[PDB]
Enzyme design. Structure first.
Site, PDB file in Angstrom:
ATOM      1  N   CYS A   1     -36.576  -7.035  21.616  1.00 17.37           N
ATOM      2  CA  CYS A   1     -35.917  -7.024  20.320  1.00 17.37           C
ATOM      3  C   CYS A   1     -34.403  -7.197  20.446  1.00 17.37           C
ATOM      4  CB  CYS A   1     -36.277  -5.737  19.540  1.00 17.37           C
ATOM      5  SG  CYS A   1     -35.794  -5.750  17.794  1.00 17.37           S
TER       6      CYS A   1
ATOM      7  N   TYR B   1     -33.568 -12.247  16.399  1.00 24.47           N
ATOM      8  CA  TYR B   1     -32.964 -12.668  15.123  1.00 24.47           C
ATOM      9  C   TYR B   1     -31.501 -13.057  15.318  1.00 24.47           C
ATOM     10  CZ  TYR B   1     -31.975  -7.684  15.586  1.00 24.47           C
ATOM     11  OH  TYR B   1     -31.608  -6.441  16.067  1.00 24.47           O
TER      12      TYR B   1
ATOM     13  N   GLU C   1     -39.429  -9.768  18.775  1.00 23.48           N
ATOM     14  CA  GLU C   1     -38.780  -9.858  17.477  1.00 23.48           C
ATOM     15  C   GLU C   1     -37.289 -10.046  17.691  1.00 23.48           C
ATOM     16  OE1 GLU C   1     -40.152  -7.503  13.947  1.00 23.48           O
ATOM     17  OE2 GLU C   1     -38.311  -6.410  14.389  1.00 23.48           O
TER      18      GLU C   1
ATOM     19  N   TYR D   1     -34.008  -5.216   8.345  1.00 23.61           N
ATOM     20  CA  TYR D   1     -33.458  -4.359   9.404  1.00 23.61           C
ATOM     21  C   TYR D   1     -34.597  -3.580  10.034  1.00 23.61           C
ATOM     22  CZ  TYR D   1     -29.166  -5.841   7.435  1.00 23.61           C
ATOM     23  OH  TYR D   1     -28.145  -6.654   6.992  1.00 23.61           O
ATOM     24  N   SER D   2     -34.700  -3.633  11.360  1.00 21.85           N
ATOM     25  CA  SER D   2     -35.707  -2.870  12.086  1.00 21.85           C
ATOM     26  C   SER D   2     -35.429  -1.392  11.880  1.00 21.85           C
ATOM     27  CB  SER D   2     -35.607  -3.143  13.579  1.00 21.85           C
ATOM     28  OG  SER D   2     -35.597  -4.516  13.871  1.00 21.85           O
TER      29      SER D   2
HETATM   30  C1  LIG Z   1     -36.961  -8.809  11.743  1.00 24.26           C
HETATM   31  C2  LIG Z   1     -35.467  -8.647  11.688  1.00 24.26           C
HETATM   32  C3  LIG Z   1     -34.912  -7.434  12.118  1.00 24.26           C
HETATM   33  C4  LIG Z   1     -33.535  -7.242  12.087  1.00 24.26           C
HETATM   34  N1  LIG Z   1     -33.013  -6.023  12.512  1.00 24.26           N
HETATM   35  C5  LIG Z   1     -31.642  -5.842  12.481  1.00 24.26           C
HETATM   36  C6  LIG Z   1     -31.075  -4.627  12.872  1.00 24.26           C
HETATM   37  O1  LIG Z   1     -31.799  -3.695  13.295  1.00 24.26           O
HETATM   38  N2  LIG Z   1     -29.709  -4.474  12.813  1.00 24.26           N
HETATM   39  C7  LIG Z   1     -28.870  -5.483  12.381  1.00 24.26           C
HETATM   40  O2  LIG Z   1     -27.655  -5.290  12.352  1.00 24.26           O
HETATM   41  N3  LIG Z   1     -29.424  -6.676  11.986  1.00 24.26           N
HETATM   42  C8  LIG Z   1     -30.785  -6.846  12.024  1.00 24.26           C
HETATM   43  N4  LIG Z   1     -31.308  -8.057  11.604  1.00 24.26           N
HETATM   44  C9  LIG Z   1     -30.379  -9.128  11.098  1.00 24.26           C
HETATM   45  C10 LIG Z   1     -30.131  -8.927   9.588  1.00 24.26           C
HETATM   46  O3  LIG Z   1     -31.285  -9.186   8.824  1.00 24.26           O
HETATM   47  C11 LIG Z   1     -29.015  -9.822   9.044  1.00 24.26           C
HETATM   48  O4  LIG Z   1     -29.314 -11.181   9.338  1.00 24.26           O
HETATM   49  C12 LIG Z   1     -27.633  -9.479   9.586  1.00 24.26           C
HETATM   50  O5  LIG Z   1     -27.289  -8.152   9.228  1.00 24.26           O
HETATM   51  C13 LIG Z   1     -26.577 -10.416   9.002  1.00 24.26           C
HETATM   52  O6  LIG Z   1     -26.715 -10.466   7.590  1.00 24.26           O
HETATM   53  P1  LIG Z   1     -25.461 -10.475   6.627  1.00 24.26           P
HETATM   54  O7  LIG Z   1     -25.957 -10.420   5.204  1.00 24.26           O
HETATM   55  O8  LIG Z   1     -24.445  -9.449   6.996  1.00 24.26           O
HETATM   56  O9  LIG Z   1     -24.797 -11.937   6.952  1.00 24.26           O
HETATM   57  P2  LIG Z   1     -24.957 -13.264   6.025  1.00 24.26           P
HETATM   58  O10 LIG Z   1     -24.010 -13.115   4.882  1.00 24.26           O
HETATM   59  O11 LIG Z   1     -26.383 -13.519   5.704  1.00 24.26           O
HETATM   60  O12 LIG Z   1     -24.387 -14.389   7.029  1.00 24.26           O
HETATM   61  C14 LIG Z   1     -25.152 -14.887   8.101  1.00 24.26           C
HETATM   62  C15 LIG Z   1     -25.432 -16.356   7.813  1.00 24.26           C
HETATM   63  O13 LIG Z   1     -24.211 -17.062   7.847  1.00 24.26           O
HETATM   64  C16 LIG Z   1     -24.389 -18.355   8.415  1.00 24.26           C
HETATM   65  N5  LIG Z   1     -23.525 -18.557   9.599  1.00 24.26           N
HETATM   66  C17 LIG Z   1     -22.819 -19.706   9.864  1.00 24.26           C
HETATM   67  N6  LIG Z   1     -22.136 -19.546  11.023  1.00 24.26           N
HETATM   68  C18 LIG Z   1     -22.395 -18.311  11.507  1.00 24.26           C
HETATM   69  C19 LIG Z   1     -21.958 -17.642  12.649  1.00 24.26           C
HETATM   70  N7  LIG Z   1     -21.027 -18.190  13.424  1.00 24.26           N
HETATM   71  N8  LIG Z   1     -22.392 -16.352  12.897  1.00 24.26           N
HETATM   72  C20 LIG Z   1     -23.258 -15.732  12.012  1.00 24.26           C
HETATM   73  N9  LIG Z   1     -23.688 -16.404  10.881  1.00 24.26           N
HETATM   74  C21 LIG Z   1     -23.266 -17.673  10.625  1.00 24.26           C
HETATM   75  C22 LIG Z   1     -25.847 -18.478   8.812  1.00 24.26           C
HETATM   76  O14 LIG Z   1     -26.522 -19.211   7.811  1.00 24.26           O
HETATM   77  C23 LIG Z   1     -26.335 -17.049   8.827  1.00 24.26           C
HETATM   78  O15 LIG Z   1     -27.684 -16.999   8.439  1.00 24.26           O
HETATM   79  C24 LIG Z   1     -32.674  -8.255  11.642  1.00 24.26           C
HETATM   80  C25 LIG Z   1     -33.238  -9.469  11.205  1.00 24.26           C
HETATM   81  C26 LIG Z   1     -34.615  -9.669  11.241  1.00 24.26           C
HETATM   82  C27 LIG Z   1     -35.150 -10.997  10.767  1.00 24.26           C
END
Ligand SMILES: Cc1cc2nc3c(=O)[nH]c(=O)nc-3n(C[C@H](O)[C@H](O)[C@H](O)COP(=O)(O)OP(=O)(O)OC[C@H]3O[C@@H](n4cnc5c(N)ncnc54)[C@H](O)[C@@H]3O)c2cc1C
Length: 296
Positions: A254, A296, A294, A77-78
């Site tokens: 971003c 994502y 950046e 998370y940024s």
């Molecule tokens: C450098 C960087 C900075 C970031 N900054 C922020 C931030 O500031 N705020 C923020 O909210 N997030 C940010 N993110 C995104 C964050 O890291 C997560 O990916 C996001 O919160 C979702 O993760 P989760 O564990 O809730 O979902 P997860 O449980 O990990 O589910 C997402 C995964 O489900 C699968 N999937 C299949 N279909 C779908 C679909 N239809 N939609 C989505 N996923 C699907 C994919 O494999 C996907 O990777 C950032 C990511 C990066 C890499």
């Protein structure tokens, strides 16, 4: 040897095997009812133990186990707060988190693991943190820089961090005198993030801060097309193009992967007029630390 603020940069103080355990101090929904999803602003205590700076990320290890019984893999998370944190004392860090909920191809509702963990946090709860992580989104050293910030959704986060340092804090070694220009794209007015803080900064520092919102489900261009970030940039296209030519202009982008595509179309149309190939010139600007992405 970098144009960015990397002096004494710290990365990876805390690793997944031994995270820093912070405490949730605050967690507030910052979007209204007419938003497609919820975004939350949350504050964690750090005891001054995480020496992060503007533009960096932290990893979060959600409580519990994955399907194989292992600790959850970190999500990044940024950081949404300046290095000092929202309370000016280097003892907190803030995140801007969208709660991920989607329907898969079979038609089932899926909740994102880490984002739902984060948005569900109550004050007093423990949070496992890694990092700090990242160097791409560090701020320019130049206090007279033109800093163009292109954000969608939670992509606002590192720019809130930059802007707090620029406008809400006194730093003897950094007195911002340039032009910060934020474009923020969201679907609805209820999806706007940090509107009050941003509009206060704009009332505060009008010579040094410009602010444009692009509310795609609510605003349209002369042709009737939805107002995305690129649509809003189009209204300042020649000025943005002239700014880019300057050695002290830095672009940062971003948010949602794919936001860069519509932006590239605007830049291609500007560049082509001058016989320049944007897809090649963008690579040059990236190498020169003037086009910093950046998504994502
Ligand atoms: C450098 C960087 C900075 C970031 N900054 C922020 C931030 O500031 N705020 C923020 O909210 N997030 C940010 N993110 C995104 C964050 O890291 C997560 O990916 C996001 O919160 C979702 O993760 P989760 O564990 O809730 O979902 P997860 O449980 O990990 O589910 C997402 C995964 O489900 C699968 N999937 C299949 N279909 C779908 C679909 N239809 N939609 C989505 N996923 C699907 C994919 O494999 C996907 O990777 C950032 C990511 C990066 C890499």
């Amino acid at each position: 040897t970098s144009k960015k603020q990397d002096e004494g940069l710290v990365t990876n103080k805390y690793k997944p095997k031994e995270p820093y355990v912070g405490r949730c101090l605050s967690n507030t929904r910052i979007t209204g009812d007419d938003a497609p999803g919820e975004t939350w602003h949350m504050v964690f205590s750090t005891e001054g133990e995480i020496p992060y700076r503007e533009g960096q990320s932290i990893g979060i290890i959600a409580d519990g186990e994955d399907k194989n019984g292992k600790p959850h893999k970190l999500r990044l998370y940024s950081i949404a707060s300046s290095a000092l944190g929202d309370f000016g004392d280097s003892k907190t860090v803030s995140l801007c988190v969208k709660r991920l909920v989607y329907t898969n191809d079979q038609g089932e509702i899926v909740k994102g693991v880490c984002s739902n963990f984060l948005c569900d946090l109550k004050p007093g709860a423990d949070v496992k943190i890694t990092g700090p992580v990242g160097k791409e989104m560090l701020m320019p050293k130049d206090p007279n820089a033109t800093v163009i910030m292109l954000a969608t959704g939670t992509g606002i986060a590192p720019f809130r961090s930059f802007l707090w340092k620029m406008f809400l804090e006194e730093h003897e070694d950094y007195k911002f005198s340039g032009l910060a220009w934020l474009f923020l794209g969201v679907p609805t007015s209820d999806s706007l993030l940090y509107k009050e803080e941003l509009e206060k900064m704009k009332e505060m520092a009008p010579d040094n801060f410009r602010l444009d919102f692009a509310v795609s489900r609510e605003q349209t261009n002369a042709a009737g097309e939805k107002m995305y970030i690129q649509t809003r940039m189009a209204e300042y296209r020649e000025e943005l193009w002239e700014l880019l030519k300057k050695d002290n202009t830095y672009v940062y982008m971003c948010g949602l992967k794919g936001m860069e595509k519509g932006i590239d179309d605007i830049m291609l149309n500007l560049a082509a007029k001058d016989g320049i190939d944007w897809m090649q010139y963008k690579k040059q600007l990236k190498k020169g630390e003037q086009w910093n992405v950046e998504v994502y």
